[model samples]
Target: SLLQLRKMIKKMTNKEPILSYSKYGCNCGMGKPVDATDTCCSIHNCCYGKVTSCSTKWDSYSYSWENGDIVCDEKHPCKDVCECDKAVATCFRDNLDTYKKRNIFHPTSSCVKVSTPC
Candidate 1:
């Protein structure tokens, strides 16, 4: 038990626990963890932040990452929350999980960027 404890302590100190995408889920904590669910961003902060100018009521969706999936929510991530285009004629899901014909603007990214040491 003592040997196990020491090893665990070392691992914890050396790295933060990484949730597997297939097993990942969460609360956004104080600040939301941006993803495909997050189209807006910190101005050139992310590789996919605000690819276009902002618009409204584009019939979008929001997502909460969990178990290797970006689930869709038609209820609301509403307002100017980033999302995706419809899946009617595309090879994509009509959700933020895929495609980007209708994602809004996030103005800030880096849901994972921080000096935060776990």
Candidate 2:
């Protein structure tokens, strides 16, 4: 337990808050998120800061459009970038909600940019 605790502490200290956005999610794309899957993408928007390198990057997809089975293999500077998306995709199955596409807009609380250890 002590060893695990130390590891956790190290990870916590390695990551720090970079920035947060009031209009979290629903960026660089059209429409609002309808379900948890979309929310996952929204969270990913802030989680994925501008890629300084690697022009080829992951694209956003709605749960309804992708049927909740999305992949995030696209490359980025840090593994956290893709993992952030993968983690959100994994959330698709856990949340009990249907995917719907909405042109309408809605406000979100906020999204924080967490410093990547990588």
Candidate 3:
């Protein structure tokens, strides 16, 4: 399944060095994408890039054409690389079809919960 997700990522984008932050079946025994809010779940630590913060809602996901970067809070654009909470979540290449069959669900807020500092 991990290979499948990786393949999808590559197919979507014709870039190289596609990396995934989260592993296969981390929570609930299901391979899922990490939400934009949570950082630790990201497999590649993507949040460290120029884009720092993201909106709490999934509808906010977008991309910035000015900078040619996907706005993490808006949509799931298969990007060369992506991060959540300063952590890399997923990476893609310029293919867009090689791995389209992979059905890795991106982790949503319902699957993750935020906690206050103790």
Candidate 4:
């Protein structure tokens, strides 16, 4: 039960996708309708999983008014959320699009190979 990254055609939808980790288990991490990586974890929130994190800021890797879901804005790369890896590059980053933003991690190599229709 593996689905490719969900494609939120910007040209068509022009709306931020409401990513849900459990949107569809059938699609593991990448599909048109949904994409969820069974690997990633919401593990924590704006806080570093603690009451006192980021000196009262939104904490790391936390987003939105909901369960921290936000549009896939790579431009909004979160250093704090990805600090657990603490490697900078490994820092969690996603495309400012639906497919990448549907989940924290990127889709498989094959999914990446598929070019955007533009």
Query: Best-fitting candidate, measured by TM-score?
Result: 2
lDDT of candidate 1 vs native? 0.27
Better of 2 and 4 by TM-score: 2
List runs of model 4 lying over 4 Å from the truth: 1-17, 20-36, 42-52, 55-79, 82-118
TM-score of 2: 0.35
1-118: candidate 4 lDDT, tens digit per residue:
0111112222223432234433312233232222322222222221234433333233334322224323332343454443322211111224223235434343443243323211
| Number of the top lDDT candidate | 2
Each prediction's Cα RMSD? 17.4, 15.6, 11.6, 13.7
- Model 3, position 79: C-alpha lDDT score: 31
| TM-score for each model | 0.18, 0.35, 0.22, 0.21
Summed over model 1, clashes come to 10
Prediction 3 TM-score vs. true:
0.22
| Cα lDDT tens digits for candidate 1, 1-118 | 1222222223422322122111111111112434432222221123113334433223343544446333445565442233322111111122224423222222334334454212
Q: Which run of 10 residues does model 2 get worst, by summed lDDT?
A: 15-24
Error of 3 at 61 (Å): 4.9
Error of 4 at 47 (Å): 9.9
The local lDDT score (0 to 100) that residue 98 gets in candidate 3 is 36
Instruction: Tell me how far candidate 4 lies from the true structure as C-alpha RMSD in angstroms.
Output: 13.7
lDDT (0 to 1) per candidate = 0.27, 0.37, 0.31, 0.28
Instruction: Please give the lDDT score at residue 90 for candidate 4.
Output: 16
